[PDB]
């Protein structure tokens, strides 16, 4: 069995969105913590003194549910590395104060994005944060396999995508999460949270994540085709990468609306489930070494 | 100096006694304050500071809805995250009669002076969360006759043995920093295997509003105690007594133990190493409180039977910032 | 409260999101719920303009599943919503106008859409959104024709051209400004002033020369600009902020108002002098919209709650 | 934060060309300030902010009675110590004309208005000491059209090669700390054995008087330094230039150096691991100025050619406290 959770970017209530999700077989929810579009000023009259609140009440939820069910976000509009000086400057307030916020509420994770190559401010404020208070919430970087820009549709008429294969440029998305890492140290809080494309790339810029430490895969629901039935599905080449994600046991994120207005969501998840439990099973080794991966011991010295 | 987590908002809010016990010392305070006859004409002003998630805001409505007098409510707290439930308390429930002000006490601007300021700013052993500095930041803004509540507050020290304990302070040494530092800050625990050497006896006292020309927050006491068993002295255990209004308390000591209160537990001061205590002999304590404009430390020392090295000497181990 | 008709709520949100006026001299209102227990937004019709925001003085009313983030007048009758839900949405209004009734709901967008324009004809639509992808509908027929996946970071606003329903620029987070013509294989066009300046934020086509159109950057300048021989003709350091909005005048020598997030609307000329600016906002100014009666009035909203009219000299 | 030594003031009061150059920058300005037929009615108030044992307050008489005008001289100065030598100089010999203030400059309640505040409180990298922070406490006190000395400066960096430096900091390791603090951390020094990588480049600005209506004093910059050998990076280089009046400058900038100017070091910001670097390579420096109400610091990293760990992080291994 997996564990799997629902991505949204829109909460219009949080009792009954979780409700739903819950009710869909989801095990945990990624959302905002404050509205998406709710764009706070910090610096300058008069927007900085809006009337509050600036957020939704902790008290909505359990925090048994906050600890466990709900996976934030960062708002998208919060740009550290913007080149406009005062975007930064409010960016890096308006990233401590939601990274402040999922520390109280206790969230057990919280998402942010790379979907670009410069995110050096944004390492440093997350730094920064890390090394303020103690607390062991993790840190999920959304990384694509294939980058935004070379994803697009050949339809600009001078501005043809470049069409000659790079190897270098088909791995940019790594050198993005290796910098991003390096200068936040390696920092055991930071990990991957792996955005699956319609295009799998080279199998030579899959590899590349080898080794890399994936908490999480997120699936567009966009990428599921449909069977003879009506049914969500996948290609054969993305269940070799489910297959190969399952066997290094991380957590699947469902991301985008309904494709299927046929059934549920329920499908894209069962599927998932159905992929699952169609693996092999354990060997008598694979039964043994269950709880010793990556675990590291002293040799013995029996002498 | 950190911002309180939801979760631990939410553990203390479950105590059966410290908020009854705080509408209790409001009411008692606001029929003092507002004659019968003057009953609908008065409209007494109370603020609270460090409102939390706001269980005093409800109290003290709680407390003149059974007084039958009226208030006008500011909500004071510097947690931002705190301050977003607050904000969302006034909007579905408080309406205008609390104000809700996001800030530290001790640089909100008031826009007028206050009837009560109430609080509940305490830690183990008193006065260690720095509540005479916040008041003493705060006090410009209480009407020339104002009620603080707590009005005063004192903390107590008993010598204790433990073996037990004195190896948990051996356990928390660290990477990085002075291999004895362990031992030259003090920890909140639930103290159970342990002996108490002595009675405990007041340390410090604070009392608000401070009317004092010169403030000074800085104290020296030096402490006696009786010692009739043998033994060695490992600690000594810190608690606290508070008057929040005339006869109306909270209590740690366990002499006077308010009966249900779990908010807090006591504290201990260990000392690097234990020091040998024949039957007859006085321990001799000293603590100080220091500080500078940054933050505020304790440092303290034996000097009978035998002496210590003091302790935390500058708060090099151990400060509480401002 | 002395109207608040069947259907409307009790409540208008607090965060107003869109204003627009009616040729016969009304005015629509856009609003999101954007921080409290509840996300969501509410449309308003208000035949009294002086009468707003007032829920009591109105006309017609209805919540919203969620936030609007952006619409715009369909005709006379039709509402068209971009939804924060990911649902662009279309909102028939009564026979009798008094009632707004759901026409269509379509969940086709993976994230918030932000932006919406109708398309001349009145008979399509262009959507933008977060997902990154631009979107064309048929509204009679409630699908989407083409999807577009030209940009490479979130679309900011898609603005339809007034006369020719193949055209209309869109400008995104990926520093790109596309002109579209649905005709050609290939149908966006790169068109910035093409020194990779401060991202695009803001369109508006001029409404007679169907061939200037205006942008705001977000870095507060706005800038004229020539499609046939694009070398950025003219900009002015209009802001202080963001340019969220662009709005010409109904005059046949159009002036252009230009609203920002540090909350100040300004009236710039057809060469974008200051001739007028108002701080009556105090929050970020989300619309501005042109008396079709009064020409020399402007109605503006904010996250301030406030629905402002100006008059400009 | 600290009190310098007597010691370390009669160092420095021997440089030949510092004092020299302040005399000069006060002397032009008094002229542009009171026009001839002024020279006899117009008595400027001139301010020495950090006046030392006194030999800034030495140059302003020096630089009055040689542009024939007239002036009022405050002496402020924190360190008691420094205060000491200050009062004995004005009872002994320079009378009531310099007043002696024993205080902070951010503390200091001006008595009337400044003409001019004077002072030096520079290190190798300009604003290290913490002059912007200081000169912003004390600009409510200088007259709205008042001249700051100095006015304005501006930090610079040079990446170097140096295997000898490398291991100078490396040897730097302390027990209790981390073992990595070291290269967090800027040394004041006469950098000897290594090789300049990249000419210098500016960094961070500050003019005075500040008339910003919001003040902050934080910032980024990114530097990109063209480089043509193959090599090893092992820290940047700091120097500073600074504006006193018009064209009287001070640099340890060495394209520009002031000629016998010894008392300011360069200053060296190491980095944890070596980078290497082939000949047509960029590299990319970054660098935050950061703060809170308590102290100052920096931060810093490397995003090319390869990236290396953002240093000092929170100020965790240094900072400059207020
Ligand atoms: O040093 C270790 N493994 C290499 C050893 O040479 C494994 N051999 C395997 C053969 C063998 C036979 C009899 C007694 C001991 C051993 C040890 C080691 C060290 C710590 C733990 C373990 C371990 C413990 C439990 C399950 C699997 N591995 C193994
Ligand atoms: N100087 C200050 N200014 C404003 N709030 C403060 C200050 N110092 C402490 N606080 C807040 O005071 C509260 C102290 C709490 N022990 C009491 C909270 C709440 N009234 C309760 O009893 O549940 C915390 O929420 C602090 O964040
Ligand atoms: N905030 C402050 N208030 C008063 N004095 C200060 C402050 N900050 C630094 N100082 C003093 O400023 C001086 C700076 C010195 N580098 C200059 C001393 C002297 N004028 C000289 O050039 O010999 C030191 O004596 C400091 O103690």
Not at chain 1, 88 to 106: D, V
Request: with cysteine; glycine share 6%.
């Amino acid at each position: 069995r997996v564990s799997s959770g629902r991505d949204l970017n829109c909460v219009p209530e949080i009792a009954d969105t979780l409700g739903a999700v819950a009710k869909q077989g989801f095990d945990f929810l990624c959302m905002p913590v404050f509205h998406p579009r709710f764009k706070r000023e910090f610096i300058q009259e008069p927007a900085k003194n809006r009337p509050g609140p600036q957020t939704r009440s902790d008290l909505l939820l359990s925090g048994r549910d906050w600890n466990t069910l709900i996976v934030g976000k960062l708002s998208p509009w919060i740009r550290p590395d913007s080149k406009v000086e005062k975007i930064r400057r409010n960016s890096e307030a308006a990233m401590l104060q939601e990274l402040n916020f999922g520390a109280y509420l206790g969230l057990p994770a919280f998402l942010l994005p790379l979907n670009q190559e410069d995110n050096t401010n944004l390492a440093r404020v997350l730094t920064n944060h890390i090394h303020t208070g103690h607390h062991s919430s993790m840190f999920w970087m959304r990384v694509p396999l294939v980058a935004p820009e070379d994803l697009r549709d050949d339809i600009i008429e001078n501005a043809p995508t470049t069409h000659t294969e790079e190897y270098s440029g088909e791995e940019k998305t790594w050198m993005w999460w290796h910098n991003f890492r390096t200068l936040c140290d390696y920092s055991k809080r930071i990990a991957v949270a792996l955005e699956i494309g319609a295009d799998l790339p080279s199998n030579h810029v899959i590899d590349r994540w080898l080794g890399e430490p994936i908490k999480a895969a997120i699936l567009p629901t966009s990428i599921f085709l449909t069977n003879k039935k009506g049914f969500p599905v996948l290609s054969k080449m993305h269940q070799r990468l489910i297959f190969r994600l399952l066997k290094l046991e991380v957590q699947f994120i469902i991301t985008g609306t309904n494709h299927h207005s046929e059934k549920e969501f329920c499908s894209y998840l069962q599927y998932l489930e159905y992929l699952s439990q169609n693996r092999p099973p354990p060997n008598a080794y694979e039964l043994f070494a269950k709880g010793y991966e990556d675990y590291l011991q002293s040799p013995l010295q029996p002498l | 100096m950190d911002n309180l987590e939801s979760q631990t908002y939410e553990v203390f809010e479950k105590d059966p006694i410290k908020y009854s016990q705080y509408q209790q010392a409001i009411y008692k305070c606001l029929l003092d304050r507002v004659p019968e006859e003057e009953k609908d004409t008065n409209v007494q002003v109370l603020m609270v500071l460090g409102a939390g998630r706001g269980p005093l805001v409800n109290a003290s409505l709680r407390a003149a809805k059974q007084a039958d007098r009226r208030i006008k409510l500011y909500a004071v707290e510097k947690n931002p995250n705190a301050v977003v439930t607050l904000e969302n308390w006034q909007f579905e429930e408080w309406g205008s009669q609390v104000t809700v002000v996001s800030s530290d006490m001790r640089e909100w601007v008031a826009p007028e002076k206050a009837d009560i300021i109430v609080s509940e700013l305490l830690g183990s052993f008193a006065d260690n969360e720095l509540s005479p500095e916040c008041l003493d930041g705060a006090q410009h803004f209480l009407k020339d006759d104002g009620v603080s509540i707590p009005g005063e507050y004192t903390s107590f020290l008993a010598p204790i043995s433990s073996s037990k304990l004195y190896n948990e302070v051996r356990a928390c040494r660290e990477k990085d920093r002075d291999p004895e530092a362990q031992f030259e800050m003090p920890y909140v625990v639930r103290l159970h295997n342990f002996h108490q050497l002595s009675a405990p006896q007041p340390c410090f006292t604070f009392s608000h509003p401070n009317r004092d020309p010169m403030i000074d927050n800085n104290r020296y006491c030096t402490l006696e105690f009786p010692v009739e068993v043998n033994t060695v002295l490992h600690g000594f255990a810190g608690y606290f007594e508070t008057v929040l209004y005339q006869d109306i308390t909270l209590s740690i000591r366990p002499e006077t133990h308010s009966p249900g209160m779990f908010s807090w537990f006591p504290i201990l001061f260990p000392i690097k190493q234990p020091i040998t205590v024949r039957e007859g002999q006085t321990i001799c304590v000293r603590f100080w409180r220091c500080s500078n404009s940054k933050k505020v430390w304790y440092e303290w020392a034996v000097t009978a039977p035998v002496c210590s090295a003091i302790h935390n000497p500058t708060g090099r181990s151990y400060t509480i910032g401002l | 409260e002395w109207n608040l008709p069947p259907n409307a709520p009790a409540c208008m949100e607090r965060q107003l999101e869109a204003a627009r006026y009616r040729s016969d001299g009304a005015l629509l209102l856009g609003a999101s719920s954007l921080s409290g227990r509840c996300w969501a937004g509410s449309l308003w019709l208000f035949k009294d303009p002086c009468a707003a925001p007032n829920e009591g003085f109105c006309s017609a009313g209805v919540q919203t599943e969620a936030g609007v983030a952006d619409l715009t007048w369909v005709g006379e009758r039709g509402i068209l919503v971009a939804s924060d839900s990911g649902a662009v949405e279309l909102w028939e209004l009564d026979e009798n106008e008094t009632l707004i009734v759901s026409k269509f709901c379509k969940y086709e967008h993976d994230d918030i859409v932000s932006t919406v324009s109708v398309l001349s004809s009145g008979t399509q639509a262009v959507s933008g959104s977060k997902d990154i992808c631009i979107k064309v509908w048929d509204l009679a027929q409630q699908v989407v024709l083409s999807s577009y996946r030209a940009h490479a970071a979130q679309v900011t606003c898609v603005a339809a051209s007034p006369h020719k329903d193949s055209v209309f620029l869109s400008c995104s987070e990926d520093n790109r400004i596309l002109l579209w013509d649905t005709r050609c294989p290939k149908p966006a066009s790169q068109i910035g002033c093409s020194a990779p300046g401060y991202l695009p934020t803001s369109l508006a086509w001029h409404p007679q020369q169907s061939e200037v159109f205006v942008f705001g950057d977000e870095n507060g300048t706005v800038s004229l600009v020539d499609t046939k021989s694009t070398s950025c003709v003219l900009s002015s350091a209009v802001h202080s902020q963001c340019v969220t909005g662009l709005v010409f005048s109904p005059h046949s020598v159009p002036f252009l108002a230009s609203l920002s997030e540090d909350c100040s609307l300004a009236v710039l000329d057809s060469s974008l002098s200051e001739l007028f600016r108002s701080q009556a906002h105090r929050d970020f100014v989300r619309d501005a919209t042109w008396s079709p009666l009064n020409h020399s009035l402007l109605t503006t909203v904010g996250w301030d709650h406030q629905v402002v009219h100006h008059v400009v000299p």
